[PDB]
Design a protein around this nucleic acid. Sequence first.
RNA 1: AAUUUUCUUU
RNA 2: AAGUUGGACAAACUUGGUCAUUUAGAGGAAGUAAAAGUCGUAACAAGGUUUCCGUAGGUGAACCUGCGGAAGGAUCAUUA
RNA 3: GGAUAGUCGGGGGCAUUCGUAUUCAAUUGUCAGAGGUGAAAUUCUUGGAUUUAUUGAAGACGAACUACUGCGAAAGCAUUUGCCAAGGAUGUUUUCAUUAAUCAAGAACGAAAGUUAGGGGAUCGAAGACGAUCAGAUACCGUCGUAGUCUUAACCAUAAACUAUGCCGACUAGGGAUCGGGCAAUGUUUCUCGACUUGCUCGGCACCUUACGAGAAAUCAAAGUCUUUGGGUUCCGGGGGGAGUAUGGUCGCAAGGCUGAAACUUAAAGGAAUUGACGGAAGGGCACCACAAUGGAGUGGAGCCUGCGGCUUAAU
RNA 4: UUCGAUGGUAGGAUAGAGGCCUACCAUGGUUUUAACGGGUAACGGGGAAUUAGGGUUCGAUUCCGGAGAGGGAGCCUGAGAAACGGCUACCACAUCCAAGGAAGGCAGCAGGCGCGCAAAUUACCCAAUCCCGACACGGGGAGGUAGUGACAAGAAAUAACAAUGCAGGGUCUUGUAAUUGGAAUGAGUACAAUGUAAAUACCUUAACGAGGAACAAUUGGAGGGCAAGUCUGGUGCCAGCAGCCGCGGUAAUUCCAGCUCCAAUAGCGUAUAUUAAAGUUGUUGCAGUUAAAAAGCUCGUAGUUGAACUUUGAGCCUGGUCACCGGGGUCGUUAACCUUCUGGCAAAACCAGGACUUUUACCUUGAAAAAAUUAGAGUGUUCAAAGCAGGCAAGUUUUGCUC
Lengths: 142, 129, 97, 150
Amino acid sequence: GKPAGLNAARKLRNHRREERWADAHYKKRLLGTAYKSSPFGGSSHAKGIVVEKIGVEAKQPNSAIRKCVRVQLIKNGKKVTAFVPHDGCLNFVDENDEVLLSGFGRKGKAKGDIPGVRFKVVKVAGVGLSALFHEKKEKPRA
Amino acid sequence: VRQSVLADCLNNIVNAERRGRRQVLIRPSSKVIVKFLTVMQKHGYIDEFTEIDDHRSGKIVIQLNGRINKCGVISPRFNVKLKDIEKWVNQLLPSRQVGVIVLTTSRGIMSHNEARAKDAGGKILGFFY
Amino acid sequence: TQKRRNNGRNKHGRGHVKFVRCINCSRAVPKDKAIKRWTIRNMVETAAIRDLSEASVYSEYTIPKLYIKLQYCVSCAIHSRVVRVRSREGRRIRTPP
Amino acid sequence: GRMHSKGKGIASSALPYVRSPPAWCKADADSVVEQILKFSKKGMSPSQIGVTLRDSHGIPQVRFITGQKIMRILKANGLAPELPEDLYNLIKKAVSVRKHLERNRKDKDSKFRLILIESRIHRLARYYRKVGALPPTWKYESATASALVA
RNA sequence: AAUUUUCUUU
RNA sequence: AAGUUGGACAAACUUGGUCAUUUAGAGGAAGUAAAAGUCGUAACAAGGUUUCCGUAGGUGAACCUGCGGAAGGAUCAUUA
RNA sequence: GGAUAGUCGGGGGCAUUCGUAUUCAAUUGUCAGAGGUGAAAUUCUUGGAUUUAUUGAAGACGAACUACUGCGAAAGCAUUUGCCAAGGAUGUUUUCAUUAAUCAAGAACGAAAGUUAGGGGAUCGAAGACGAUCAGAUACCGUCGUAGUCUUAACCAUAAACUAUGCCGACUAGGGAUCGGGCAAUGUUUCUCGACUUGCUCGGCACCUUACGAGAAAUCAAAGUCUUUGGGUUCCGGGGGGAGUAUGGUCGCAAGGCUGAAACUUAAAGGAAUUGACGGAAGGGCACCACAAUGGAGUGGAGCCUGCGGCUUAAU
RNA sequence: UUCGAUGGUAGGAUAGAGGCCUACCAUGGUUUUAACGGGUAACGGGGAAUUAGGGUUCGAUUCCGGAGAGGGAGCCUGAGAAACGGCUACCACAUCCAAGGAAGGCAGCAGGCGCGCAAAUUACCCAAUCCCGACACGGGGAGGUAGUGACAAGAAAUAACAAUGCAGGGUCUUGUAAUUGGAAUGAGUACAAUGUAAAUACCUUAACGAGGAACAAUUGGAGGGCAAGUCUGGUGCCAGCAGCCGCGGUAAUUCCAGCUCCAAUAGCGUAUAUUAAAGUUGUUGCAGUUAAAAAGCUCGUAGUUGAACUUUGAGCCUGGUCACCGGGGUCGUUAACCUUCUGGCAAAACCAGGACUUUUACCUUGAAAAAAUUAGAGUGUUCAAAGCAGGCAAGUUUUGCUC
Ligand SMILES: [Zn+2]
């Protein structure tokens, strides 16, 4: 079973220290992967430039076009994939719009049927989504 | 090999009590076992026990009367201060009124309540209720 | 799950047992796992006793027999119907019917 | 629980409750002490001393009449072997196994048994050096084990 | 002896 | 004072070995995901050669075979 | 722990003895098939195949006895005898006196297969060669057949290496078999012992019923004595792929062994059990919308009535 | 361990011990109880978040200690600096040059550029706290005050008294009001007193200041989780919604438009980090036959764990909160403060005071111990986040008392 001696504190502490690496949560914190190879170095949001738009296909059992775009980060140089939440915004969003990218809400995991996408766009041209949609704000003449 | 004799004694006693037998034979015996049993006797959970004095560790025959649920040992012998008695009672005893925790206090083997009265901590031996 | 407590063979207190050859398919089946039967057959059929007696010598000699030990594998025994698949309750019996 | 085996035998001798000299005996204490000394000069181990005295001469336990163990008697009267009997027997067994192995190198079972005996000898030697029965620089070498026995 | 295959749903 | 001779601390530069991290490259071999491809059917029933493990060989492929093991088998069973 | 007495063991090693079977070789007897398979087919046989009979050689293996039986730490160990070392249990009013349990690091053994040199190569048999089955058989089937299967001196070091269940210690329900030892019988039997019978006890291999108890259940006398959670001590896991992969280190002639990730992807993977369905699984039976019966009448083969596809047209 | 790594001698240097340095003599010191090396997106602590307990995470940052003033190195002054709002040289930058040269360092207070998801005025004042100096008199971007915000905590605008018929209820009371009307109205508007260095603000001041755009409450959701529609229209596996399951192929309670409802409230959602749940890190307190998991087996040293046994019980005195309990001394079982020093008695021996654990671990108490912070005692910031004050005292106004 487990050691139960009064002088086995070192043995118990060492075994717990070795075994805690098997924990998925502890490993993801102690490896530093957020600052080592992750697209986001712990940042909640990051600015980027739109590269292109990709029509990803939904997985089973759904079937639709996800209306995604590809965005190149300006502070890291890593090319990632972005998801536009609403409908009819890919026409408004053109190349080089200075978009803002954030997480999806699954702690960096793909949400729903969208394959291989982990980020979502929040602002376009520095004005914010759902503002130009309701015709409250307008895209600057850039 | 045998590590603690109190644990074997308490395991045999609780096994006999669960089985419903009115007597149990305990071997080996020791001073710690004797002090534990007299504490249980003065609290009323265990009836008379006869210590068979051999030219060895010695045996003992214990008369049971039910009315106990489980008597166990706490290994290793953790050091229990006065402030930790309440935590141990909440951790091990069924309630604040029913249940006895035995400590090998420097004054002697005694229940947790009278150890509190004497205002002296020690090392935890076991419990019974 | 364990279908059988003995794991299908009589191996208690052993580490290895020799393997025998099935008569039909010549498969290697362990000695404690092979189904054993003893064919004790008269050297002639019971329908030829009169013909043998009328064509024999030695004033009513004793007709010999043949003793053959047959060791089947699991698949061959099931196909030959010497051993049959039984219910779960009936699996726990060993006395021959 | 055998130290180097899986056996769980409990065979032993159960000494009587009466830790007294025999009620019907004429051992005379000192006569038995000189008798043990005579047998020690004859050259038999203390186990053989007790076995012969119990089986033939009729004294059940020597310490009951003498007041001390026979090893204590031998040490007091000076006939104390340098090597303890149990260690001497273990080393003699190891020598016999080593001789068997050197004449027959293919006995892997004997090699395994020699490893067990070597471990037992070292553990016993460590105990004896710790208690003080042997010099602290006792050590155990297979080359000189034959000379140690003889 | 010999017997391969059953698209994504309602 | 200007100036002179030695000593210690000693920034900094060229080179060589070592450590840590980051970053191109002609080319090569992998995994990872598919609304309705091509080849055939290995496994799940005795899956139609019972299955699996270790090892070795071979073949377009699932895979086949040799040797030794296991039932997680399709037998808890022939006392005569 | 050690000693001692009678034992016990298919425990180890060495030397030695015996058994039939397989293949082959020589010789003798008549002749037409022999092998093999569902069917065959390859192959060899009036030059004597196959069979029968005598003798010999080679290598492998110890059938039956052989078991819910034994031994060993495990892998494993099955012909006779002798020798050597060692081992468990039992008996003991024998000896020592805590000498003990479990382990990192480090070491011994480690099936089978695989490697390097020597010997030997009967049988089987990876690779392979043909010959049948099939649409394709590259496989399963038949014959031959190299490495291998045997052994010595060096290697490695893993298997479903399993009881998928670490080791030591205490307690816990009823019974009957079996092995080894011991105790008891004014017990039985056979020319002082053995065999058999009964009871008791210790240590093993297991078994039946049951569940005070446990588990998710299958089930378990331990997998019980755990929410009433603590006898002691090692190994090992933190959802599924990636992946026992990459890299690094280490051992190995090599094959490979040990240690052993990360990025990314995913909402499942998995275990036990239940009800249906299915089975080229089994056992009981039912059926001219099933078969047998030399079945009877027939249809399809001919020409026409009529219906359905296809063609055409304007709708057909 | 070369070029000081471990120790001895002697010397040098330092304010001072010291391999800090030098000459000689020995090979020593640490380490599986993890030495050494590497990483740290690591200044450390008081402390903060979650809270059965145990724990986990964070702590640049109002207090303490350390380091730095672009990276090093050296040095003067001074008691005190290896000081940078002191100096010197190199390295990387910026600047006027007449081309000879000169000259610096805001990780200080403001402000600018760039990196950025991410963070404020080129303001006033030494009045309060304190510091410096020759010193009542001077200075202090330390410090106090204010301008700016969506957020850090505490209090609360968007109302409300009746006539009215219907649904009513049981002669007393709620609601839909295309209705009225006189009421209390505060946000603001102005002014006065107070406040303050000057102010702003708070408090406070008469007085102007709603009849409906009055001076329009928002944020999400309305299938389960989890609370609130199978309502009406548009599309038809398309747009899309959607934290997971999941909805959508012409009846869409889950897509977008309207109506209404549900939750919080001047706040709500989203993205990320972390905590509880996670008994999925399990010492408390996991699991290993079949879900992931017992090394093929054995020996063996660190490590962990280690049978029993060495003075137990009975009877008193006295004083302590309730037939009860804790505490000090004794005599006999068996000798009852072992032993030492000092002082006394004296045939060795006895009494009193001090020391008294062989040696710990363990438990109890005390000492010295930073504050804030945590709990918490007292106390009319109108309550509260607060703060450490405050109170007496209406009938004299007493140049006091009390905490
Ligand atoms: Zn067969």
